[PDB]
Amino acid sequence: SMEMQLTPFLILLRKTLEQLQEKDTGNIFSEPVPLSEVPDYLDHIKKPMDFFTMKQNLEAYRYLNFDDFEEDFNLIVSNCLKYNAKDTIFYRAAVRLREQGGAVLRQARRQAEKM
Numbered sequence: 001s002m003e004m005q006l007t008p009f010l011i012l013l014r015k016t017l018e019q020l021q022e023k024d025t026g027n028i029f030s031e032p033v034p035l036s037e038v039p040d041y042l043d044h045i046k047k048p049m050d051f052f053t054m055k056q057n058l059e060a061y062r063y064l065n066f067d068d069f070e071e072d073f074n075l076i077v078s079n080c081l082k083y084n085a086k087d088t089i090f091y092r093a094a095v096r097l098r099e100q101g102g103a104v105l106r107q108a109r110r111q112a113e114k115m
């Protein structure tokens with residue numbers, strides 16, 4: 001709404017992003033997928049995403065509502081489910097992040113709604 005201030009919202013997103021990174025204990029979502037190792041990655045995946053890129057976007061003021069932020073989190077998860085076979089640790093790590101990160105996101109969104 002018109003009363004909603006920018007700085008507390010960005011502080012909330014920074015904390016939330018840190019909490020999400022903490023759930024990724026393998027740090028497999030911390031940086032872009034190394035395209036040098038998987039030249040077919042972009043065959044399947046239209047828009048790569050990762051937590052470092054999210055941090056850059058956050059600080060560049062690209063996220064001004066919670067949907068902006070959660071959309072890129074969902075990309076991290078969905079890209080990983082799409083690219084990796086179900087029988088891999090990587091696939092299961094996206095499932096775990098969706099669950100555990102989802103709880104982080106729901107509480108953070110509620111904070112944003114109070115602003």
Ligand SMILES: CC(=O)n1cc(-c2c(C)[nH][nH]c2=O)c2ccccc21
Nearest residue numbers: 028029031032033034038080083090
């Ligand atoms: C998230 C995901 O699907 N992947 C993550 C990696 C990876 C990173 C980001 N660093 N080291 C890695 O192995 C990755 C690599 C190949 C294919 C998918 C990958």
